[PDB]
Structure 1
Amino acid sequence: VSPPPPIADEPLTVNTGIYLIECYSLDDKAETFKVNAFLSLSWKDRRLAFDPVRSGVRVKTYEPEAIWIPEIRFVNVENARDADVVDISVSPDGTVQYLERFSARVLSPLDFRRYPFDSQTLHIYLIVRSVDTRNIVLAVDLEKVGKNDDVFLTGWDIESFTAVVKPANFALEDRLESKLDYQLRISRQYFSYIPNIILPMLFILFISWTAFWSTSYEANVTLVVSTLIAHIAFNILVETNLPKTPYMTYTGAIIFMIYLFYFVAVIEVTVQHYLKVESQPARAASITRASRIAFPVVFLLANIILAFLFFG
């Protein structure tokens, strides 16, 4: 079995198409995600007679060991894909339709800045292998490419699934090495994050802030320090869901700002008690009345500035 011979130096055109079936196991630390999907290759197959007799108009069924099947290699994968060939339907003429389910572990970078409200773009790269016949070119068949409407990823919604031609631009560049890029755009569902992570932190912070309406030093110390312990425990709780991230993040900036605010509150309580002991109650009362307005307003301004700095 060999590919079709040359006809008139016309470049051989291959119309590929990837039809998604399943997408699962989106691992962040490994920066991978498994896929389970179909694949279609429709290559013009003249000069290989397929019984074009008008009495043989039946669509012929062929096994993999019947003709030359173009072998496409994925660039960013862990191992070679498993070729679970599904069905090949070939007309009495040189027209080819073919479907095959594969499973692979794909490598694709993920950007986790602006983490709870982020979007991603997964990539799949395809190259074609050399052959002794004329040069093989890559083209996209827009009818074949799609998704199964039943692909479910835990916590995301799928926007689009398109394809485009991009030159490989590899340093080897033994030939042109035409390459295909498949882009899967996904968006994270963020609503549950508000009640799960955001509101409890604000409740704890306000419980801490109730110490500006009091004057008992022991009660203030207990309030602020126990609230700090609760904040650390809640950070431990929320650290499990988040992925390990060796760079700065919006949530991390918020956590750091909360730590800073706790430190400043402790300083304010200490100053108030020291003045009250040294008998300057007017100054102590003025400072403790100023704090009640100062803290929430500065917190709001810092949040606005951080939001602008991280979301354009």
Structure 2
Amino acid sequence: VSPPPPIADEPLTVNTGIYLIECYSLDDKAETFKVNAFLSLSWKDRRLAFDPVRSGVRVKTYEPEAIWIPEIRFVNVENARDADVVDISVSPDGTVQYLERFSARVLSPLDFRRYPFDSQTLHIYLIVRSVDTRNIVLAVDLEKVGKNDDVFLTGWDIESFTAVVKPANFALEDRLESKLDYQLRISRQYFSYIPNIILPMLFILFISWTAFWSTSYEANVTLVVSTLIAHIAFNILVETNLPKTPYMTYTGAIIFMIYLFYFVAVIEVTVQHYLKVESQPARAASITRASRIAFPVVFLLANIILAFLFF
């Protein structure tokens, strides 16, 4: 089999569509997601044209091996898609309608700057390489782009699945290449981060601040060092669910800042004890009373500054 010949000099237009059946395994560390979808293809092959009046048949069904099919690939996949052809239909004018169901693991970079209050645009890039006989170009049939109502991505809200209708046509290894960008817009369900990480992390921090109502150095050291260790555990827990980024994330910034608050609380607890031992408790009392206001106030203002810089 060979490509359909051009009537004049025009490129062969392959109309495409992706209909999402399943979305699963959005892996933040790997920056991948798995997809199960319909891939629809349509192009004109005049060699396959027939008369509907004398044939009595409106459509002809072909097997993939019987006819020429464009070699359509995904750019951002781990391995080649696992595909099963569903149907091939030919209209009397020779317009071919191809439908396959496929599954693939897609590589799509994620922006973690606003994590866990982040939104993402996942991409599925469709591509075709031109043949020596003729140039193949891709198009979007909007009537064949969509998603099943039941499509759920655990921990995410699916906003939209659209295609950038204009392909990116470019030369690659002395041939033309036609690339389409299918975009799946999602927003993270931040809900569970509040009772599981944010509030427990705030509770232990506020517990360290009870040391500002205590003159017992031994108890103070226990309060601030124990809660610091619990903060380290939350830091480790959070960084296991995330890849290493060449930038600060919102959560990373707060987690890092809270260390400074633990460090300054240890200085305060040390300074307080040192002065009491030096028979200067009136002074220690002034620093401790100031700390009761300063620590929550600086914590609030630093969080307003951070929220402003990130959102």
TM beyond 0.5 = yes
Name the SS of the counterpart of 1:80 in structure 2: coil
Figure out how many residues of one structure are paired with residues of the other and give that number.
311
Give 1:229 deviation, angstroms. Answer: 2.5
CA contact (8 A) 1:168 1:176 kept: no
CA deviations on 1:219-263 (whole Å, 9 max, x unpaired) are 222222222223223334444434444542221221121111111
Name the SS of the counterpart of 1:168 in structure 2: strand
**Residues in 2 aligned to 1:25 and 1:91: alpha-carbon distance in whole angstroms:** 39
CA deviations on 1:120-170 (whole Å, 9 max, x unpaired) are 112222222333544332221110111122322121111111112566576
Distance 1:130 1:221, change over 3 A: closer
CA contact (8 A) 1:110 1:120 kept: yes
Distance 1:92 1:176, change over 3 A: closer
CA deviations on 1:160-215 (whole Å, 9 max, x unpaired) are 11112566576746244332111111111101111111111111111111111122
**Residues in 2 aligned to 1:301 and 1:191: alpha-carbon distance in whole angstroms:** 24
Distance 1:7 1:52, change over 3 A: farther
**Residues in 2 aligned to 1:74 and 1:84: alpha-carbon distance in whole angstroms:** 15
Range with bigger deviation, 211-220 or 242-251: 242-251
CA contact (8 A) 1:57 1:91 kept: no
Give 1:298 deviation, angstroms. Answer: 0.5
CA deviations on 1:77-124 (whole Å, 9 max, x unpaired) are 222223310112333442322210112222221221211011111222
**Residues in 1 aligned to 2:31 and 2:68: alpha-carbon distance in whole angstroms:** 35
CA deviations on 1:10-67 (whole Å, 9 max, x unpaired) are 4433211111122222223332222221111111233433342256134332211222
Distance 1:170 1:63, change over 3 A: closer
**Residues in 1 aligned to 2:97 and 2:17: alpha-carbon distance in whole angstroms:** 11
Give aligned-pair identity as a percent.
100
With the length of structure 1 as denominator, give the TM-score of the two structures. 0.90
Name the SS of the counterpart of 1:117 in structure 2: coil
Range with bigger deviation, 62-71 or 203-212: 62-71
Distance 1:229 1:151, change over 3 A: same
In structure 2, the gaps of 5 or more residues are none
Name the SS of the counterpart of 1:133 in structure 2: coil
CA contact (8 A) 2:111 2:120 kept: yes
Distance 1:93 1:171, change over 3 A: closer
Range with bigger deviation, 188-197 or 19-28: 19-28
With the length of structure 2 as denominator, give the TM-score of the two structures. 0.90
Distance 1:192 1:274, change over 3 A: same
CA deviations on 1:241-290 (whole Å, 9 max, x unpaired) are 34444542221221121111111111112212222222223222222211
In structure 1, the gaps of 5 or more residues are none
Name the SS of the counterpart of 2:166 in structure 1: strand
Check if 1:216 corresponds to 2:216.
yes
Name the SS of the counterpart of 1:198 in structure 2: helix
Give 1:292 deviation, angstroms. Answer: 0.9
CA contact (8 A) 1:22 1:151 kept: yes
Distance 1:207 1:280, change over 3 A: same
Query: What residue in structure 1 maps to residue 280 of structure 2?
Result: 280
**Residues in 2 aligned to 1:272 and 1:309: alpha-carbon distance in whole angstroms:** 35
Name the SS of the counterpart of 1:18 in structure 2: strand
